Amino acid sequence: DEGQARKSQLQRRFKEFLRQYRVGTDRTGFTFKYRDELKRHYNLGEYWIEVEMEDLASFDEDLADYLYKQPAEHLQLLEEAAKEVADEVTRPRPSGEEVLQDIQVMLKSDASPSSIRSLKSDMMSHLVKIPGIIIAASAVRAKATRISIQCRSCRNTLTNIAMRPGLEGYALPRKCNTDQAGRPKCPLDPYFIMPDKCKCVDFQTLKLQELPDAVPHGEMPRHMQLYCDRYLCDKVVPGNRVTIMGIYSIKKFGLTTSRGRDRVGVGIRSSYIRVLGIQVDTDAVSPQEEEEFRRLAALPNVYEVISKSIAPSIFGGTDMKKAIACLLFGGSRKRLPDGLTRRGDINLLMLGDPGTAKSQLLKFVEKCSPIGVYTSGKGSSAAGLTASVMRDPSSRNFIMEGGAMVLADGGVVCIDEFDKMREDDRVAIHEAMEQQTISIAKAGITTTLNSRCSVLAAANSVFGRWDETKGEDNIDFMPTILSRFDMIFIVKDEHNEERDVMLAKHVITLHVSALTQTQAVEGEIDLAKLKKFIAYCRVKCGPRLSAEAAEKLKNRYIIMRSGARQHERDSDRRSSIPITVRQLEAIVRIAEALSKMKLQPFATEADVEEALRLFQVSTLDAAL
């Protein structure tokens, strides 16, 4: 009774918070924020809301303190209050919407996060805020919220038994409640779960790795298990950087020591986090963002603005920064009626001298790309890059795990030290670079995966520094791999008095400026916005060449082929850099990328002119 009274009072306070909370001022106006959000979400068929802890503290500090210290009970009370308020906001309801739905209440806060390493025993059963990286996600499974049980002998049924949230089970009644007289006694453990009477929700399990910068020196990164349910399920994927609010909890399995439990230490338990809210970190588009993106795409010098924003810390490399912008946006993937596909992704290779910021460029593109994976050729294998076959520990069966080019599907994979890769490992990438699939036939698995990613590779020349006398001996790659690159840049560290003085002053100023507090630059776009702008354009615009632009491209391609053919004849050596139909389609992709920057449905002659200029400076220069 007294406990019931206390619970009812707390639920009433949560209900009043939901009914009365307001944002605004008497000069402007007022909005009942949470009541309105609940009403709109329920009408949309989305039975969840997100509540800020600061708002709750503003309304009632004690309620927020209780929610922080004892999250489970008070969160249950808050959900019941949310259900009550959802009935009142929507209470006269249309036919087929009679039954009131449960409301999931998500939690959000402005507090500073805490690390995995800082999670101690004294914080058990508390509300915690943790940053990390998603490294693994399980399949979506069913978790019972309500069960009905029936007696084997007498068919006596107990219905609507509530289940605990999280990774917690239930202990069935030991004995039945039927009358002792007349009937032979019911057997021990008489109850079984009725399949069709059970109410279930979707659940998921995740692994959260600590942030790379938080790892103590010389230690392998640690991870933690996450439990997600209902609308939190299937929100994040491996590779996402997130901040999670949750309950630090313990797995509650059977009390019995079944199979003769024989742990290496006594009284140990398994920890996990019961997730109450997820926030994806930058490192859907609001209408304000969409309007801002449309404004950027319409700037007459948008191409210059984007190029200036790519690795602004690097001193020069304007042509290579322009080509990287095209790679980030990409071309238009197409499927012809016969079923054959033409890829829209752009591949770029930087081959050149040491200390020319090739690795710094690759690191930037990893941060800038909406989907980006950085790997090293030396530290890679054929199975690691594409996909692997291995034994599943639980099932005792063969499974498949994706490599770098599966994790980078839909984005960019940056392969540094490309020359150090073994020939057998390099050759495993040919199919993925052109057909954009990975074919596997191993250990009884015959399947095909998607690998629609752009390759950005860096390498050194054969003799360390490019030697003009050695000629074609500077390049070691086969013609097959080189023909799969849209643009090939030969980077030569040219020594000049005037440029060297300018570069040195830039580098010194860069090191001194590390102390300066960060400031915006008028002519550039910050990385966070550029990252979002790229993602928006790739989903919204797939351009095509205009009929006039195609005629211009056709005529220049024929000239380029004749010049390459003539050059090989005169030199008596077949050139290392080939000029094939793939290079014609490469120019099409680069032209479409330039249009996609401007959100233009058709690529013009100016787009083809710029695409041909980029090709001239990159690949024709290498080939001649």
């Binding site: 944002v23 001022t25 000069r27 708002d55 303190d65 402005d110 507090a111 500073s112 102390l515 507090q517």
Partner: protein, 283 residues
Amino acid sequence: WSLHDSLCNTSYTAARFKLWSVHGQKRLQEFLADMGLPLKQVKQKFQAMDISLKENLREMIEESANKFGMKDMRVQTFSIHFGFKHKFLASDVVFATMSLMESPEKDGSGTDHFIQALDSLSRSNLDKLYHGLELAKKQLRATQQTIASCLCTNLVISQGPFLYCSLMEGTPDVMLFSRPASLSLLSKHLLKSFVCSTKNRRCKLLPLVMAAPLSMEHGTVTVVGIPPETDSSDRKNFFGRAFEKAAESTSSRMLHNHFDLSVIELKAEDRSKFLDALISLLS
């Protein structure tokens, strides 16, 4: 903000703890230990901090500060509350408005920065006030960094009658202190820190003259003068007339454009010359 950040970026406590030094951090840790506040709590944002610690915070801070040689930790002021959320102390509003007005974001002119500051004072433009609070945090951090750079390198050199500190273009945050009001406030904070952290008794009773670059095209420098820092100072300043008398006697190219006569614009080449006259005038 967080209590730790507030303690580190308040010129009063930052000057008395000598947080620009290596032993100042240890002294701050000792202060917090005397309070009994867990480090993780004081490093958390004040709003998110556990309410049990907030019950007697002002009294306990006053007592601990009294033990540590700060007797003026408490000031009489005012606060304004509206809504469920909105609560502000007067000094917070002052700092936010100042930061909006003296913003370093040069995309907007100074008449544009004035308009933002004026708008922020109306409750309809609350978002501007919060933005100004963030800008104020950045400005306070920059001020402490500049003070540390000046005090650690011994850039405050005593001429006979006054102390002289000059900012150079190599300084990282110099841009944030090119505007005269920011330079004046920085000079006052710097003098307070210097007086707290110096050994010479004479240098504690001196006024300060501070210079910072204004325009690299015309070679102009902003010069400010402030009086000695004392607990009972009458807050009276004699540097405007002294500057006008030095410039006249030496024939330098000075401009009086600020409404305060102690802020001047000087041709950099004349600077040296100017100063000598000033010295001879005040000694």
